[PDB]
Design a protein around this ligand. Sequence first.
Ligand SMILES: NC(=O)c1ccc[n+]([C@@H]2O[C@H](COP(=O)([O-])OP(=O)(O)OC[C@H]3O[C@@H](n4cnc5c(N)ncnc54)[C@H](OP(=O)(O)O)[C@@H]3O)[C@@H](O)[C@H]2O)c1
Ligand SMILES: NC(=O)c1ccc[n+]([C@@H]2O[C@H](COP(=O)([O-])OP(=O)(O)OC[C@H]3O[C@@H](n4cnc5c(N)ncnc54)[C@H](OP(=O)(O)O)[C@@H]3O)[C@@H](O)[C@H]2O)c1
Lengths: 382, 391
Amino acid sequence: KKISGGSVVEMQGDEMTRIIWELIKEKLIFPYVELDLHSYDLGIENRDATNDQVTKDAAEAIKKHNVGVKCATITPDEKRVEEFKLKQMWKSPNGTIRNILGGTVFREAIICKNIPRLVSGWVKPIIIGHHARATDFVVPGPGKVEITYTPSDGTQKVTYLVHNFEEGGGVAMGMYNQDKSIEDFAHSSFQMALSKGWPLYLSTKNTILKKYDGRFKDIFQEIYDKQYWYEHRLIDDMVAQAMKSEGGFIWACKNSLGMMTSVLVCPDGKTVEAEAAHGTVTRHYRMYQKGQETSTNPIASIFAWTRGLAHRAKLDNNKELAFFANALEEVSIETIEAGFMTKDLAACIKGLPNVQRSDYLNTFEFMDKLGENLKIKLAQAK
Amino acid sequence: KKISGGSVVEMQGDEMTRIIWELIKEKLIFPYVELDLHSYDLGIENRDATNDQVTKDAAEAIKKHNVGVKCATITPDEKRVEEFKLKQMWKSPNGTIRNILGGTVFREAIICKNIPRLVSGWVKPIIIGHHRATDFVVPGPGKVEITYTPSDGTQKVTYLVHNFEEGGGVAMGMYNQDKSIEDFAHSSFQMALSKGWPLYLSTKNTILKKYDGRFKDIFQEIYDKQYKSQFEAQKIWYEHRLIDDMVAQAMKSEGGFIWACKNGSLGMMTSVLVCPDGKTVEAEAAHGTVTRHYRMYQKGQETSTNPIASIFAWTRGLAHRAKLDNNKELAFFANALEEVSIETIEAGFMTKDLAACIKGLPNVQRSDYLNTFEFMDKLGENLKIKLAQAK
Ligand SMILES: NC(=O)c1ccc[n+]([C@@H]2O[C@H](COP(=O)([O-])OP(=O)(O)OC[C@H]3O[C@@H](n4cnc5c(N)ncnc54)[C@H](OP(=O)(O)O)[C@@H]3O)[C@@H](O)[C@H]2O)c1
Ligand SMILES: NC(=O)c1ccc[n+]([C@@H]2O[C@H](COP(=O)([O-])OP(=O)(O)OC[C@H]3O[C@@H](n4cnc5c(N)ncnc54)[C@H](OP(=O)(O)O)[C@@H]3O)[C@@H](O)[C@H]2O)c1
């Protein structure tokens, strides 16, 4: 009856996104898909109770099962330490997860025909990638700061003057990048393309950091010929090319939030972690706690699930799951395009002072409209 | 009858901006203000004829007279060397001027009510100020180290940057003198007090604990010793914020702050070089010479070039001159010219770039905008009326 979805790592989160995450599972996922679900509770109280061990176990499960879908989580600050009486200022779960997995983060805004964009010409989305270290120190007083390279065979020594501090002190730092990290960025970028069926654009300073940025340009061109369209451009020339076009390209960059998605793509081409690019929407959660009506956009959170499920389906050659993930993305866009949307989107169209209650749906009404539309779409498909 | 404006250093430039610059002087400045004008011709042919000596003399004149107003200039590349048969690839005049003066460049987009922004909440502008490196290819395995050798002969300090054990890559060294950080802090505090807005410094001091920590410590020290009382008197403040926390607050805010960063139509983008002394200022448009429009102008074709950024170079320069000289009539004139410029656009009279921001470039009709000369004439008519009404 229901689709056999296979192995998925799910991470529960905090505040308004936690409410939305449960609604998505109950209304959009669980009525259609059965999963061998590896669920980790990354809610702040559980991270505190387990001394953050839950976060490390979730990252290891993503590494083992290749598919991670994560709800937004609170990153503690002093105010959060007091609010929850935390044992310590726990590090960001996203930072912990990224450190364990590695990879490149790709960000993509979901586009709807009736929702204004930065450039009206944008019909197809733009997927921006950045690869995801330094030795800094105080220069106590006058003297030379030099950076040297000694090849391991001892045949040469190259010394570069960083600066001769003559009047006083300051600060200095040394930075590096290994060819393997640049290679991993290139792979993830060509493999983000091919999967999406779009062209790739690499942008660098190149005119300023000629040797550092030149190596990225050279490694990308080399990998494009040996193992794989693709084109390089300067930052200034690139933003101009983005001001034109219908969009629909991957932009590897070396240097409403409710519609912003994020995907971590590991160099292996096997592991993916998807999530909303926004936070826990604390202000809406405070309204919910006071009995006030909320209108929180679930699109970014739904697309974490669809990107995760589409990846799972690709790994397992599961056609029914691949169809479901795509159908849920289309239903989400189509619902908004038919005029049914949350307040943030009504405000993008009308301007916040001109938004009336009849222009939007509350959190629960929007989720119910998506559920009704999804039921219809899948019934007609079979 | 005309305002006695005093001592101003003016730098003439190239292509479309050179045409606009002359129109501004003839229609907006010279009918109202008399200046002891120190004019330098930084047009590309004159920089070539003088072996760039004109650029160095202009920078020394700004140092001496404290007020510089500069027109956009061509920075030569190989194509420009061929076009003008240049003796050499002269360095950017902006780079030469900045090296002689020092100081921090503050950028600000001019806001009009009927012109769409990035964040609709931004009612007040955001003024962003920014603060060299030695990079190289690491051809294969080996050690990259960064060393500090005291000038007094005490023990050399060696830090390992990375030991490349397989394959190559790239490495770089970067630095900052305490004096450059102190200058950045002073120019930033001077900017915020002049504008009457709060100041934020953003760094990644949690990652670059020593490097960015020094910026955070020097700004806080200079604030506590020399500017905290003055900031309180104007009900404004200074705060350090991490870059991640800073971008999030910038979207939430209605604008109206100075942002010192440790790291829309170009026709509306202004730039001001603020020297740490609080006395010297160099103002200019943040855009270039608008070569594409200049090519149309050379062919006798109608152009619609936005002069706002160029007008604001003159108004920022004149407002600073007026502040230094306690010249109330000049202070009023500079403010009136800024207001006339914004008000003209807000009344529906604008160049094509702005009509395109409203309607979208494919939907712009000739009746939606004014050409370069029509727009300058409308500003001249509005300026005359405003100053008459002012008494
Ligand atoms: N990936 C992550 O886990 C992640 C990322 C960022 C922040 N955070 C955490 O999230 C918490 C809250 O951070 P924050 O309030 O600064 O950022 P945020 O949750 O992204 O929310 C900022 C504002 O953006 C709007 N917004 C964001 N997501 C929305 C959605 N889905 N639907 C409708 N409007 C939406 C709301 O604007 P209006 O208020 O005008 O309605 C909201 O108050 C913090 O504890 C922070 O650590 C986590
Ligand atoms: N501060 C300076 O002295 C400075 C700064 C930057 C560059 N440059 C020099 O400027 C020359 C030309 O550079 P560029 O064409 O790359 O840059 P640019 O002059 O800033 O012009 C780029 C484009 O932006 C638009 N634009 C810029 N200023 C405008 C204005 N005032 N009104 C209307 N539209 C405006 C035009 O767009 P559309 O074509 O779409 O109409 C123009 O073609 C080069 O020689 C460069 O060295 C000098």
